[PDB]
Amino acid sequence: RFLCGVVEGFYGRPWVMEQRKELFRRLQKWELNTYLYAPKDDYKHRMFWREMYSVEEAEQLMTLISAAREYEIEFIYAISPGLDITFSNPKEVSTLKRKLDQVSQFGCRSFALLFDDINMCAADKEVFSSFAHAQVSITNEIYQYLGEPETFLFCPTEYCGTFCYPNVSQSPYLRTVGEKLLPGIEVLWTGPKVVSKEIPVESIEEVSKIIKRAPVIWDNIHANDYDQKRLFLGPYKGRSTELIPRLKGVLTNPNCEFEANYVAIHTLATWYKSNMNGVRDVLYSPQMALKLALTEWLQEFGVPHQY
Amino acid sequence: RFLCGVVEGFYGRPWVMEQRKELFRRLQKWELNTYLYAPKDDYKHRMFWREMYSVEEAEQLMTLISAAREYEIEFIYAISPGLDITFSNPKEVSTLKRKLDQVSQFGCRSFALLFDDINMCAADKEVFSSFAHAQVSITNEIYQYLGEPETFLFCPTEYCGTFCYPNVSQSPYLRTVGEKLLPGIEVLWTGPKVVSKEIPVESIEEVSKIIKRAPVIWDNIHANDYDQKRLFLGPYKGRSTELIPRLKGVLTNPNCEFEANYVAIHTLATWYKSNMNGVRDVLYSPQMALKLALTEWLQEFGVPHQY
Amino acid sequence: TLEDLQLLADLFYLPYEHGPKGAQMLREFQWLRANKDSEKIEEWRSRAAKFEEMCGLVMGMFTRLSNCANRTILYDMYSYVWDIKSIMSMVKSFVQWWAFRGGLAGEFQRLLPI
Amino acid sequence: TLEDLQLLADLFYLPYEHGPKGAQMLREFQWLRANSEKIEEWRSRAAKFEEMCGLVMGMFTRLSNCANRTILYDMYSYVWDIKSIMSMVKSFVQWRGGLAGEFQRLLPI
């Protein structure tokens, strides 16, 4: 029912396979259940999405998906074709079909299409009455091609309140997304702003009305890729436990530095467990969640681990 | 005996062992002879200089020195205690000996001490007459302790004209280095500025007179760690061939990205070879060396290599 | 090709110097920007269509480079190619015509002289 | 110790909020900055902040000697940047873009 876990979606150096396996172990341990593969600087995911994997790459992706399954974790493989795809080109759709087919042969079942941080090209202006339509048409063709996978995610260009033109409720793009996009495909949402201070319960009910469904949060609360001098070791804060019966999931995009995400993922698990069975803060305090996380963290520091 | 090669002495993600071995393959192939291990962001070189190596790290460092020796490449190991060493403290000096002892147990026979981007503490005020005396004293004690290695390098604080207080010829700091630093220890110089546009013959005559020796050039011409949007694929330029009979060596600190450094190393090899047998630009044309370096590089792009 | 690398090198040349081809394009764009009455409209669109031909060559070279057999060289420098590819789109297309940084350390630094 | 990670988490808290211990130091420092019988107060407050600046270095160095180098190596770069700044704050109390840039700079923005 609920997709709660981590999204490796930051700009910067992507985590190694050793760290990813370790993350799945922590996720299972803390009763979390999902992982979204979205590293912006892994060329095969974004910049060079058309590029197929090599024998070696295929082998580790196979080990990682195997590891993911072993720890009862949902591995969601994402691709960001948005920076240069020709939506109307049948070769571009065939490339996305071949690339996601190779990944399904690795053990992947759950996929995602991301269309964030991306003017239309003449050829697509003929064929498509808008961007929202072009993205939805390609997303729906892939979802059906992939045999309607249970877990399929869609990230809109307008993914936070601030990005909606003119506003959230009146946005023609979100209207189009909610209307024309298949009901079996999930929509990602990062709240009022990219890095939302708070995520009001009124804020997401307003979105659920235009996208005609409950969204999955892509939380950038612990994200630190936007500033070299900043690190976030604080607790999960600003998102009420009342939000859980109103969402299909929460996936936190945390700090680039893997080992600094202990509290980030710890407090989130405490938050998800404090109200996993609800009605469509009373149950959780970040102050108390922070103390519990640092207490568990502290012991780890004393355990010898060599670089 | 002239030291020509590459110094990996930049800020950023240090190179992997695989890349470092391939570098030795390239240096030998192009008739170059040296490699100075100085990654500024390798915690056990700068920041955590006191920290000894673990088995796995010792094993890796062993294989690398073995590989250098195998490709007729001199492996010079650098260490920067500058940011927080207490020069008067016998525990600090003992720590610098323990680590260089452990490093020589890995097959390393050549070493370096850098005191470059480093304000004296009370105890070094009592014990040391000046800053230049502090470094010189600890450097000479270590060199002698290490049984006077044939290749011992030292990087001064004033490593370029621009860093010299008041000037190059009248610097009390350099005066002390040239006078009190043992004649068998070499001094690194980057030229008139940190990234010198040109390195005039006259400028080196001036430095050599104060340091009482011909320096080893630490070249920052292809260094790109100061700007995220800059890359240097141009040729080794601005340093006359007339310089070779006036230096003990040339170590280029190139781009952070290993594969971009083909032209930087290729053109440096051509410049060295053009006047490898000195006297006291007619012999070298950056324009020509670039024509050859690209012709040779272009064949590498066609060779299949998976990431 | 060789002429492909010559151009590539000229765009990412030296710290105090751009390559010949790099300096050429820069000199021309500066000129196009700085330029019935007189027939010097003939030279502007001739020189502007020649530049939109040079923006098309440089970008054909970029796509070519991305299709190289050696993905190891490419994955190390393409991030730099990708940026100049974007900045030559808007250059051609032109001619055709956080926020409270540093965290606690930074906040403490604002209350310090230097 | 727990009180150390509680201090560590307070200085690298959340994007729009610094932790209590971090917020207190900044506030107390903004106070010392704005002041020159009543001298005894500033003097006692300058001496107590100086002790605060000295305890945080002590936690910083303690952390640097942790058994878990794997955790340490990921975040000590941040710790080293606030330690450099904690020191001169205390000492204060005691007291281009390339060819792409060349092109983008000539474009309307």
Report the 10 Å Cβ neighbour count for A2.
Answer: 15
| Amino acid in position D71 | I
Beta bridge partners of B34: B5, B74
Provide the H-helix boundaries in chain C.
2-11, 20-33, 41-66, 71-86, 89-95, 103-109
Is A253 marked as binding a ligand? yes
- Please tell me whether residue B216 adopts helix, strand or coil conformation: strand
Distance separating alpha carbons of residues A229 and A221, to the nearest angstrom: 16
Closest by CA position to B147, among listed B192, B96, B187, B110:
B110
Tell me the nearest-neighbour CA distance from C112 into chain A, angstroms: 17
The chains in contact with chain C, meaning 3 or more Cβ pairs closer than 8 Å, are: A, B, D
Q: Which residues of B touch C12 (CB under 8 A)?
A: 230-234
Tell me the nearest-neighbour CA distance from C82 into chain B, angstroms: 11
Q: Do C9 and B294 touch (CB under 8 A)?
A: yes
Residue in chain A nearest D75 by alpha carbon: A260
Q: What residues of A are labeled active site?
A: 117
Distance separating alpha carbons of residues B80 and A195, to the nearest angstrom: 39
- Please tell me whether residue A281 adopts helix, strand or coil conformation: coil
Q: Do A307 and B43 touch (CB under 8 A)?
A: yes
Q: Which residues of C touch D82 (CB under 8 A)?
A: 104-105, 108
Run of H or E residues at A202: helix A201-210
Distance separating alpha carbons of residues B31 and B269, to the nearest angstrom: 7
Q: Which residues of B touch C87 (CB under 8 A)?
A: none
Distance separating alpha carbons of residues A132 and A153, to the nearest angstrom: 15
- Answer whether D78's CB lies under 8 Å from D9's CB: no
Residue A32's Cβ-count burial label (10 Å; 0-12, 13-18, 19+) is: buried
Cis, peptide link before residue B156, omega less than 30° from 0: no
Is B21 marked as binding a ligand? no
Run of H or E residues at A8: strand A3-8
Closest by CA position to A234, among listed A224, A243, A249:
A224
Experimental method: X-ray
- Residue ranges of domains in chain D: 1-109
Per-residue DSSP letter, A225:
T
Run of H or E residues at D99: helix D99-104
- Answer whether A111's CB lies under 8 Å from A149's CB: yes
**Which tokens in the block code for residue B263?**
């032209």
Distance separating alpha carbons of residues B118 and B82, to the nearest angstrom: 6
Q: Do D2 and A298 touch (CB under 8 A)?
A: yes
Provide the H-helix boundaries in chain B.
17-29, 55-70, 90-104, 122-127, 131-145, 172-180, 201-211, 262-274, 286-302
Q: Do B57 and A13 touch (CB under 8 A)?
A: no
Tell whether D96 is within 8 A of chain B (Cβ). yes
**Sign of the CA dihedral running C56, C61, C66, C68:** positive
- Please tell me whether residue D89 adopts helix, strand or coil conformation: helix
CA angle B9, B13, B16 (to 5 degrees): 85
Run of H or E residues at D21: helix D20-33
Distance separating alpha carbons of residues B203 and B169, to the nearest angstrom: 10
Per-residue DSSP letter, A195:
T
Buried b (16+ CB within 10 A) or exposed e, B258-295: bbbbbbbbbbbbbbbbbbeeeeeeeebebeebbeebbe
- Answer whether B185's CB lies under 8 Å from B141's CB: no
- Answer whether B201's CB lies under 8 Å from B236's CB: no
- Please tell me whether residue B112 adopts helix, strand or coil conformation: strand
The chains in contact with chain B, meaning 3 or more Cβ pairs closer than 8 Å, are: A, C, D
Is B159 marked as binding a ligand? yes
Closest by CA position to A215, among listed A178, A241, A180, A256:
A178
Report the 10 Å Cβ neighbour count for C35.
Answer: 11
Optimal mutation site among D63, D74, D83, interface A, most CBs of chain A within 10 A? D74
- Answer whether D28's CB lies under 8 Å from D75's CB: no
Q: Do D97 and B231 touch (CB under 8 A)?
A: no
Please report the resolution in angstroms.
2.8
CA distances from B208 to A48, B143, B250 (A): 51, 21, 15
Distance separating alpha carbons of residues A224 and A231, to the nearest angstrom: 6
Q: Which residues of D touch A21 (CB under 8 A)?
A: none
Q: Which of B84, B117, B124, B219 is catalytic?
A: B117
Run of H or E residues at A155: strand A152-155
Q: CATH second-level architecture of B1-307? A: Alpha-Beta Barrel (3.20)
Per-residue DSSP letter, B31:
T
How crowded is the C-beta side of B192, counted as CA atoms within 13 Å?
10
Buried b (16+ CB within 10 A) or exposed e, C59-89: eebbeebbebebbbbbbbbbebbbbbbebbe
Per-residue DSSP letter, B170:
T
Cis, peptide link before residue A200, omega less than 30° from 0: no
To the query of whether residue B84 is one of the catalytic residues in this protein, the response is: no
- Inter-helix orientation angle A90-104/A131-145, to 10°: 40
Closest by CA position to B267, among listed B254, B280, B278:
B254
Optimal mutation site among C6, C10, C12, interface B, most CBs of chain B within 10 A? C12
CA distances from B274 to B34, B296, D11 (A): 18, 18, 56
Q: How far is CA A170 from the centre of its chain?
A: 25
| Amino acid in position D106 | L
Q: Do B306 and A43 touch (CB under 8 A)?
A: no
Run of H or E residues at A301: helix A286-301
Distance separating alpha carbons of residues B68 and C49, to the nearest angstrom: 54
Facing C101 at nearest CB: one of A54, A229, A231 = A229
- Answer whether A83's CB lies under 8 Å from C82's CB: no
**Which tokens in the block code for residue A258?**
């893997």
Q: Which residues of D touch C91 (CB under 8 A)?
A: 103, 107
Facing C76 at nearest CB: one of B258, B263, B306 = B258
Facing D103 at nearest CB: one of C87, C109, C113 = C87
- Inter-helix orientation angle B286-302/C2-11, to 10°: 120
Q: DSSP strand E in A175-306: where?
A: 186-189, 216-219, 249-252
Q: How far is CA B300 from the centre of its chain?
A: 28
Residue B205's Cβ-count burial label (10 Å; 0-12, 13-18, 19+) is: exposed
Q: Do A54 and B307 touch (CB under 8 A)?
A: yes
Q: Which residues of A touch C102 (CB under 8 A)?
A: 227, 229-230
**What are phi and psi for residue B192, nearest 5 degrees?**
-55, -40
| CB under 8 A, 24+ apart: contacts of D19-25 | D19/A234, D22/C104, D25/D49, D25/D52, D25/D56
Distance separating alpha carbons of residues D6 and C107, to the nearest angstrom: 20
Q: Do A47 and C82 touch (CB under 8 A)?
A: yes
- Please tell me whether residue A24 adopts helix, strand or coil conformation: helix
Tell me the nearest-neighbour CA distance from D2 into chain A, angstroms: 6
Residue in chain B nearest D74 by alpha carbon: B43
Distance separating alpha carbons of residues A154 and A140, to the nearest angstrom: 10
Q: Which residues of D touch A298 (CB under 8 A)?
A: 1-2, 5
Q: Do A307 and B13 touch (CB under 8 A)?
A: no
Tell me the residues of chain C between 15 and 44 that have a Cβ less than 8 Å away from chain D: 18, 22, 26, 29-30, 33
